[PDB]
Design a protein around this ligand. Sequence first.
Ligand SMILES: Nc1ncnc2c1ncn2[C@@H]1O[C@H](COP(=O)(O)OP(=O)(O)OP(=O)(O)O)[C@@H](O)[C@H]1O
Ligand SMILES: Nc1ncnc2c1ncn2[C@@H]1O[C@H](COP(=O)(O)OP(=O)(O)OP(=O)(O)O)[C@@H](O)[C@H]1O
Ligand SMILES: C#Cc1ccc(Nc2c(C(=O)NOCCO)ccc(F)c2F)c(F)c1
Ligand SMILES: C#Cc1ccc(Nc2c(C(=O)NOCCO)ccc(F)c2F)c(F)c1
Ligand SMILES: [Mg+2]
Ligand SMILES: [Mg+2]
Lengths: 289, 289
Amino acid sequence: MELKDDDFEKISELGAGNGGVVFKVSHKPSGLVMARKLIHLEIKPAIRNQIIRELQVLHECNSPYIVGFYGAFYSDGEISICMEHMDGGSLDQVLKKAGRIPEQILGKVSIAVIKGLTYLREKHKIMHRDVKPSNILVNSRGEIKLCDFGVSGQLIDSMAVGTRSYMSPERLQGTHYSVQSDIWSMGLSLVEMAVGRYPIPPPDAKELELMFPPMAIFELLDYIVNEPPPKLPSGVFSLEFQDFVNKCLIKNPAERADLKQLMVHAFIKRSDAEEVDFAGWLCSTIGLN
Amino acid sequence: MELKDDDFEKISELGAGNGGVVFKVSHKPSGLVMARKLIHLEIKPAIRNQIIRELQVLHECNSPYIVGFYGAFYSDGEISICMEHMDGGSLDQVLKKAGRIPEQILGKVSIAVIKGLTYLREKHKIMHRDVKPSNILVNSRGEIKLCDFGVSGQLIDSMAVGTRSYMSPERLQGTHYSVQSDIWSMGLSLVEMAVGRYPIPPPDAKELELMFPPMAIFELLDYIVNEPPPKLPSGVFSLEFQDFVNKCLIKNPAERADLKQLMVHAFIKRSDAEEVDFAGWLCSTIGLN
Ligand SMILES: Nc1ncnc2c1ncn2[C@@H]1O[C@H](COP(=O)(O)OP(=O)(O)OP(=O)(O)O)[C@@H](O)[C@H]1O
Ligand SMILES: Nc1ncnc2c1ncn2[C@@H]1O[C@H](COP(=O)(O)OP(=O)(O)OP(=O)(O)O)[C@@H](O)[C@H]1O
Ligand SMILES: C#Cc1ccc(Nc2c(C(=O)NOCCO)ccc(F)c2F)c(F)c1
Ligand SMILES: C#Cc1ccc(Nc2c(C(=O)NOCCO)ccc(F)c2F)c(F)c1
Ligand SMILES: [Mg+2]
Ligand SMILES: [Mg+2]
């Protein structure tokens, strides 16, 4: 069925940031609860046709690790992307409440991210481009899915920050970046969720004991590309997880682990095995099910 | 009269970017054409009262060089700032069409900016914080006014980028910045409008002759704080304008010119004297009057 502006009805507001507003909506003719993302864009008719036509490939994006897509269209000054409503929200949202996402669970996250990235690369020849806790979605059925990946060249162009950056050193420095940049993003995301806060600058010997000031735009980006990469605090995380993130946060794109190598890493092998009630942990900490 | 959401009616859309949408609207009970800025904010009732109460000082901001303020209020997920409709739009908008704003005119711009900054500092003890071509507004009566200055501490907090930066070296580096940061912003704005493009990185010897690739976030900010400041191309601009911007773009906050010193600089003295049809030049280049 073809999606249309007058066929929708706002329920609530799921969040916003840097270009998009997403509402929990209801598709009147189908009865389906949906998440609708609106991106306000002052765009000429000809090249918003391109964006809509380019977003049609999302119909061919089927994977348990990728958010379902229903439709995309343009309506008076906004393009609409209609996707599956994830009732658990984003990992950045569950982190606020959790305070800290346990290593066991983060392993189930890593698996999903690595499988999601892999699907997009192998079957669609695209990198994600914006991997961060807010672009990773969860639900009550325990599914962990990626959204907001780069399907549309022209939409990337049309929008082209803040004070938190998950961009790789090579991407911050120039145009010489590619799929390996997503590994850094995942790597850094996993450290953040582990310790409970954005891991740059690293916490001091006192803050380390405490848990267990805001940085300026240049101070932050300078730290990323020049000062040694963030590490997982030792002792309280397994040597398996540590090696995983360390291999992820290698500054050099070519020295850095890839999806292939990460898929067969000790931590993932260990995480595939483990019997964990994700849905249980998720709903119990966010008060849902 | 007290401003209200149901009392307004959308005419057109004037623009958007990084938090705000501004519509040309009509205030039904007064008949006044207005510019209404909406800032979408997920904010607790208690601290959106603060923002609204803090924006009331804008009622006491009266100056020919500051955009008129009518009212501010909150309405279902957005705070509204209602200001004078400037029919000429922003300097960044007139630059697109002009291609280059003549030195003579930029002198009338400088005067307004320096008088606008001065008013805000002396009479209200506030710095602007976001001086750039888009925050400088013009109209058909030839008025040149500033908007989007920092009246509200809590609103600054609530919003706290892109790929063009007008932030001073000291502000990009830390919290050790103040009113002198606005001078850099003005300084850099004036170079941009003069030559026709954002002046970092500087144009090469070939591009200089031609007129008369996009930079990554770190490459750009690294250039600002480390590499020598931008200069006005010699020969085709007066020695008076050159010294003005040079004195504005001194990397050191304390070595940099202030509002006092700039007010009595040769270029402003010269610009105060000159008889220029701004309204004429403006309307003629943007097709209005
Ligand atoms: N399909 C969805 N299901 C449930 N919640 C969603 C969905 N899509 C987005 N959200 C929620 O809406 C919020 C806003 O997402 P949006 O993509 O607009 O910005 P963001 O990813 O949070 O941050 P940024 O703008 O910095 O990328 C997310 O944090 C998420 O909690
Ligand atoms: N009072 C006004 N009168 C006429 N036009 C306006 C007025 N206020 C804003 N505009 C127009 O709306 C546009 C959007 O302004 P807004 O403050 O939302 O973002 P911006 O200043 O353009 O860019 P940024 O978001 O990067 O600061 C401006 O470029 C300007 O042309
Ligand atoms: C399932 C699904 C799904 C995939 C992509 C986007 N959106 C985007 C975004 C995007 O949403 N970026 O983040 C917006 C705010 O940071 C950017 C470029 C692009 F081509 C897209 F298709 C989406 F919505 C949903
Ligand atoms: C006349 C007038 C006038 C003065 C200030 C703001 N707006 C702001 C902004 C603002 O608009 N920033 O830019 C928004 C997008 O970059 C930020 C902080 C603050 F306290 C304000 F009052 C405005 F609207 C109009
Ligand atoms: Mg997102
Ligand atoms: Mg503005």
